[PDB]
Amino acid sequence: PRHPWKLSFKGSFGAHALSPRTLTAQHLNKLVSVEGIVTKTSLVRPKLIRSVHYAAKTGRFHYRDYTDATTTLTTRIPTPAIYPTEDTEGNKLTTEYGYSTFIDHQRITVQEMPEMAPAGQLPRSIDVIL
Amino acid sequence: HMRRNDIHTSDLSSPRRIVDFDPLRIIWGTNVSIQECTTNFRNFLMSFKYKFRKILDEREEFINNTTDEELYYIKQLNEMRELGTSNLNLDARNLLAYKQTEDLYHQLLNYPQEVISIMDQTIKDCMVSLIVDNNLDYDLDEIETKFYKVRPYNVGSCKGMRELNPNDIDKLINLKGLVLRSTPVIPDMKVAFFKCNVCDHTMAVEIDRGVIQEPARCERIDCNEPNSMSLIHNRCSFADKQVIKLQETPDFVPDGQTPHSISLCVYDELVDSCRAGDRIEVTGTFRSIPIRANSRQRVLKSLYKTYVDVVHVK
Amino acid sequence: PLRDLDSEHVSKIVRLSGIIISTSVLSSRATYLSIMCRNCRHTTSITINNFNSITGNTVSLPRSCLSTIESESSMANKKNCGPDPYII
Amino acid sequence: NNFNSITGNTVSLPRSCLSTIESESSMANKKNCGPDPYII
Amino acid sequence: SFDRPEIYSAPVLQGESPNDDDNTEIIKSFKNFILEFRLDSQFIYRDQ
Numbered sequence: 273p274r275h276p277w278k279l280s281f282k283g284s285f286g287a288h289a290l291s292p293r294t295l296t297a298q299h300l301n302k303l304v305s306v307e308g309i310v311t312k313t314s315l316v317r318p319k320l321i322r323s324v325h326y327a328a329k330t331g332r333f334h335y336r337d338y339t340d341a342t343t344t345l346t347t348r349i350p351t352p353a354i355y356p357t358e359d360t361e362g363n364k365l366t367t368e369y370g371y372s373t374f375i376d377h378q379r380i381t382v383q384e385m386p387e388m389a390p391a392g393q394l395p396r397s398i399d400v401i402l
Numbered sequence: 403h404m405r406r407n408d409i410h411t412s413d414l415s416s417p418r419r420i421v422d423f424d425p426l427r428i429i430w431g432t433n434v435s436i437q438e439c440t441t442n443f444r445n446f447l448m449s450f451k452y453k454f455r456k457i458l459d460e461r462e463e464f465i466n467n468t469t470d471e472e473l474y475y476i477k478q479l480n481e482m483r484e485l486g487t488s489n490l491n492l493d494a495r496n497l498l499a500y501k502q503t504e505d506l507y508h509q510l511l512n513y514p515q516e517v518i519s520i521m522d523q524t525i526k527d528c529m530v531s532l533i534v535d536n537n538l539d540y541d542l543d544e545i546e547t548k549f550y551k552v553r554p555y556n557v558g559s560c561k562g563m564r565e566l567n568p569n570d571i572d573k574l575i576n577l578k579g580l581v582l583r584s585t586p587v588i589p590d591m592k593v594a595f596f597k598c599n600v601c602d603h604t605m606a607v608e609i610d611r612g613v614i615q616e617p618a619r620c621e622r623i624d625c626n627e628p629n630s631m632s633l634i635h636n637r638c639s640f641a642d643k644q645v646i647k648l649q650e651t652p653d654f655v656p657d658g659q660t661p662h663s664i665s666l667c668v669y670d671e672l673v674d675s676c677r678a679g680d681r682i683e684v685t686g687t688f689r690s691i692p693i694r695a696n697s698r699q700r701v702l703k704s705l706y707k708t709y710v711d712v713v714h715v716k
Numbered sequence: 717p718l719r720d721l722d723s724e725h726v727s728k729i730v731r732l733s734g735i736i737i738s739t740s741v742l743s744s745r746a747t748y749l750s751i752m753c754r755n756c757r758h759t760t761s762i763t764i765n766n767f768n769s770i771t772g773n774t775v776s777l778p779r780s781c782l783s784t785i786e787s788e789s790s791m792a793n794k795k796n797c798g799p800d801p802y803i804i
Numbered sequence: 805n806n807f808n809s810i811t812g813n814t815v816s817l818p819r820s821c822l823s824t825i826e827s828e829s830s831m832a833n834k835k836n837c838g839p840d841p842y843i844i
Numbered sequence: 845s846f847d848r849p850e851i852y853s854a855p856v857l858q859g860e861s862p863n864d865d866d867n868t869e870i871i872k873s874f875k876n877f878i879l880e881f882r883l884d885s886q887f888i889y890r891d892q
């Protein structure tokens with residue numbers, strides 16, 4: 273008959289089925305399943321992935337790709353590529369929304385469920401990026 | 403020498419802003435000709451009678467002989483010379499009444515900054531000519547040192563502040579409102595006084611469109627130390643500026659409009675002329691300035707702040 | 717004459733006669749040079765029109781990136797590119 | 805092995821690259837990595 | 845995600861009185877010398 277395929281996981285996690293209170297730093301850099309209650313749900317914001325620009329003098333379409341530490345599991349060199357307001361030859365670039373790509377981004381706060389939270393102590397929470 | 407702070411003055415003698423379009427000379431950005439406006443307002447001052455205003459208002463059966471046929475502004479200028487008065491209150495509809503000034507009325511509404519200065523200059527010239535021509539006993543010197551200013555009013559319908567548009571900036575507007583409070587008298591710097599630290603040489607610099615040029619080096623030929631002029635804040639001269647919070651009560655209110663409150667600035671003699679709680683009618687030019695986002699930075703906000711720069715209060 | 721050159725002729729146009737011992741090989745100077753930031757990817761152009769100096773670089777690459785001071789982008793994506801971040 | 809400090813980095817990333825001072829390779833390929841060049 | 849704001853100019857007023865030490869006046873005088881110089885009957889520098 274282009275987007276890369278992602279993965280999702282189900283099944284028993286054993287010692288990785290945890291709680292926001294139970295999460296410590298020994299579980300860092302590990303795949304964990306966390307049961308809780310959502311308290312904060314931030315605004316869904318678009319994140320620029322590739323920006324497409326037009327040079328009217330040469331009549332050409334350029335592009336630039338952007339990345340951060342959130343989208344990748346393996347850390348690489350942080351290379352901050354600025355937004356190109358001009359090309360190599362010095363011509364002015366006009367940005368082309370609609371041809372640029374934006375990926376929806378949200379962050380939620382998962383707090384431990386009050387049913388299995390301690391009845392007097394303050395609850396613990398974590399941030400999840402979707 | 404205190405000048406006028408209600409309206410920023412314009413230099414009639416200077417040909418800087420003058421551009422010729424084809425002769426006839428026009429201030430750049432306007433359609434105002436200095437010579438033509440001076441001649442038209444002079445003819446209006448010599449030849450206005452209140453029966454013209456009665457004719458304009460379609461009020462014919464109410465015309466009387468002892469008042470309407472008398473030269474209106476001639477007798478106002480006579481009694482203004484007699485009392486030492488330095489202000490002329492000009493009704494804007496009187497300009498529409500006269501045949502030569504219906505253009506000038508429009509030029510008064512669109513470009514008050516140049517037109518009001520033109521009226522001030524020709525009022526001073528007429529003040530001189532009224533004692534030169536009729537050979538009065540008054541000395542010319544006190545008339546010359548006196549600075550005469552005009553206050554136009556009744557400029558039109560009192561449209562709401564929220565019904566104004568950005569193309570109405572620096573136009574004469576008229577607003578009926580209620581005064582809620584006023585700030586104390588604020589000193590605006592007009593002349594700055596600098597003294598050299600090592601030779602005590604003092605110089606005074608006038609302000610130029612809100613910017614004071616600090617002298618980097620001492621003006622004397624003997625002393626030329628960089629960064630030696632220090633500003634003394636108490637030797638320099640200031641001007642009065644007051645901000646009044648007005649609760650506008652317009653004639654027409656759109657659907658679901660909750661009344662707002664504006665800030666209006668008065669200067670010089672008009673300071674403390676408005677107390678809290680009175681219903682007044684303010685005419686003045688519609689101003690907008692950018693507001694600094696932070697105190698430490700000079701990065702200004704893109705959205706402008708609008709206020710009314712007051713000319714006349716009724 | 718070459719022996720009459722004094723300190724009063726410094727930075728003045730003088731006319732002097734003589735003979736030539738040696739003409740050196742042609743060095744390559746840069747008139748227009750385009751530069752790119754190492755990691756910031758900021759592109760800049762330097763045009764130089766003063767080539768008459770010897771033993772000293774009167775015009776050089778900037779010591780720091782010029783993207784921050786320009787504030788060209790509304791997004792403006794502490795980040796420091798480092799000392800001498802431009803490549804020709 | 806010391807986590808008992810508060811309000812202050814007793815142990816931090818090195819200010820400069822440690823490849824030059826070690827001289828681990830016989831090649832040793834002026835080159836400066838820059839201030840704070842290490843990433844975690 | 846906007847572009848570069850641009851700065852541009854246009855001559856409107858006459859400006860201040862020109863000074864012979866100004867760079868613009870020196871450039872204009874040199875331009876006049878190049879265009880208007882005659883050796884005997886021809887513009888040698890313009891033709892050159």
Ligand SMILES: [Zn+2]
Nearest residue numbers: 598601620625
């Ligand atoms: Zn001094």
Ligand SMILES: [Zn+2]
Nearest residue numbers: 753756781797
């Ligand atoms: Zn950079």
